[PDB]
């Protein structure tokens, strides 16, 4: 008997939906944005929070699915729709409209993908400033022991913007992008007890107390 499938690489190296957002073909505010964290989703968050420190590369897979939203015009023959995903690292220009100059992405990496093809995929190295990603932080952001308390003093991985490239047509189109993280080449340290009480907030450990286990009647109950 081999313990192969219980390695950390196999445990974590499976795609997981970290977040999914929507944007529409109408208006000029038809772009979406997301500050990148791994604590909005429950499953992957718990899996990774089984450890205090991790270090790994990432495989990013995007599942973008669109829908013809209601319209009052006659015959809405919509052509194939293409999307742009821009990554603005912390400090870069921020798209303020669907037709911003920031979308030029001279330097910011971005993907252009047309609907109906294989989901776009892109890998990213270990982009941390420390020698390992941190899952927990028993400290503050200000040296006065004030301000912010928790992992949201470390989480600073930049924002991710989404838009339709097409000019828009007679009929509205709402699209939903789903981000999928897959840790590759994993190294984890300092294991810790699994999460018991259900998550409440993305930016802190706050929990509502729960019991230790499911209950039976007596210590002998079988």
């Amino acid at each position: 008997h081999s313990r192969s499938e219980s390695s950390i690489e196999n445990f974590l190296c499976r795609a997981a939906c970290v977040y999914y957002a929507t944007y529409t073909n109408n208006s000029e505010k038809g772009y979406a944005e997301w500050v990148i964290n791994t604590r909005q989703v429950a499953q992957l968050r718990r899996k990774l929070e089984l450890f205090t420190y991790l270090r790994f590369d990432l495989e990013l897979t995007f599942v973008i699915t669109s829908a013809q939203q209601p319209s009052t015009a006659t015959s809405v023959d919509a052509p194939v729709q293409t999307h742009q995903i821009m990554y603005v690292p912390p400090g870069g220009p921020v798209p303020t409209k669907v037709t911003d100059y920031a979308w030029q992405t001279s330097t910011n990496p971005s993907v252009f993908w047309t609907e109906g093809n294989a989901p776009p995929r892109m890998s990213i190295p270990f982009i941390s400033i420390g020698n390992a990603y941190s899952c927990f932080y028993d400290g503050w952001t200000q040296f006065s022991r004030n301000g912010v308390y928790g992992i949201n003093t470390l989480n600073n991985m930049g924002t991710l913007y989404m838009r339709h490239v097409n000019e828009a047509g007679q009929g509205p189109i709402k699209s939903t992008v789903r981000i999928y993280f897959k840790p590759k080449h994993v190294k984890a340290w300092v294991p810790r007890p699994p999460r018991l009480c259900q998550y409440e907030k993305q930016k802190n450990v706050n929990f509502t107390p729960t019991g230790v286990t499911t209950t039976r009647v007596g210590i002998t109950t079988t």
């Binding site: 196999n10 590759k184 080449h185």
Partner: peptide
């Protein structure tokens, strides 16, 4: 097969081979 097509190590497959 274990031939790598990309110049960056992050592009490589997972460390699953034994």
């Amino acid at each position: 097969t274990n031939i790598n097509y990309y110049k960056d190590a992050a592009s490589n497959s997972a460390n699953r081979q034994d």
